[PDB]
Ligand binder design. Structure first.
Ligand SMILES: Nc1nc2c(ncn2[C@@H]2O[C@H](COP(=O)(O)OP(=O)(O)O)[C@@H](O)[C@H]2O)c(=O)[nH]1
Ligand SMILES: Sc1ccc(Br)cc1
Ligand SMILES: [Mg+2]
Length: 170
């Protein structure tokens, strides 16, 4: 089979995880998607000439059993850590996602990309500088996205694939 990349989208409720995922998979924006639905999506794409399958888990937070969270963290190859640029708490929450994923995977080298979504809004509480500073401290890429306009969406997911490739070649 063609290579499959298992990507997991995490972040606080309301930041735009579902809207980002649906833009990637279906190329349209969704005003409303039930905040409590978690699902696994698939899409065949070409990234730098490689035809590959993206498996994308659009997470929704707590699971029936915590073992389910640990399972997807251990299985997932790369993580999009999403906050919204107008939601400071969601940005603060990134620290916990970073830690928890590394903790489950028992690894210091986990492919991740920091995503600041809702960039189409002038309303902003998290400046680009602050997010850059955090990404710098993690040694991971940072991309500002808008699920609404699609700006940065392919870059976010494709950059995460490229981070997974760098990890695999070691
Ligand atoms: N303006 C704007 N609104 C967005 C964007 N992404 C998501 N939203 C809105 O933010 C709310 C939460 O989005 P959703 O995808 O359900 O977030 P999730 O809980 O992280 O899955 C919804 O009202 C979306 O329409 C974006 O890039 N720009
Ligand atoms: S679609 C999908 C992606 C990543 C995991 Br881990 C599980 C399901
Ligand atoms: Mg959602």
């Amino acid at each position: 089979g063609m290579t499959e990349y298992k990507l997991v989208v995490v972040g606080a409720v309301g930041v735009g995880k579902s809207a980002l995922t649906i833009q990637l998979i279906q190329n349209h924006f969704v005003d409303e998607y039930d905040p409590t639905i978690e699902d696994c999506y698939r899409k065949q794409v070409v990234i730098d000439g490689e035809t590959c399958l993206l498996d994308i888990l659009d997470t929704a937070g707590q699971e029936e059993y915590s073992a389910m969270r640990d399972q997807y963290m251990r299985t997932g190859e790369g993580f999009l850590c999403v906050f919204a640029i107008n939601n400071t708490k969601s940005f603060e929450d990134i620290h916990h996602y970073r830690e928890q994923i590394k903790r489950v995977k028992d690894s210091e080298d986990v492919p991740m990309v920091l995503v600041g979504n809702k960039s189409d809004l002038p309303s902003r509480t998290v400046d680009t500088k602050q997010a850059q500073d955090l990404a710098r401290s993690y040694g991971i890429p940072f991309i500002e996205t808008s699920a609404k306009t699609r700006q940065g969406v392919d870059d976010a997911f494709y950059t995460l694939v490229r981070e997974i490739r760098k990890h695999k070649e070691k």
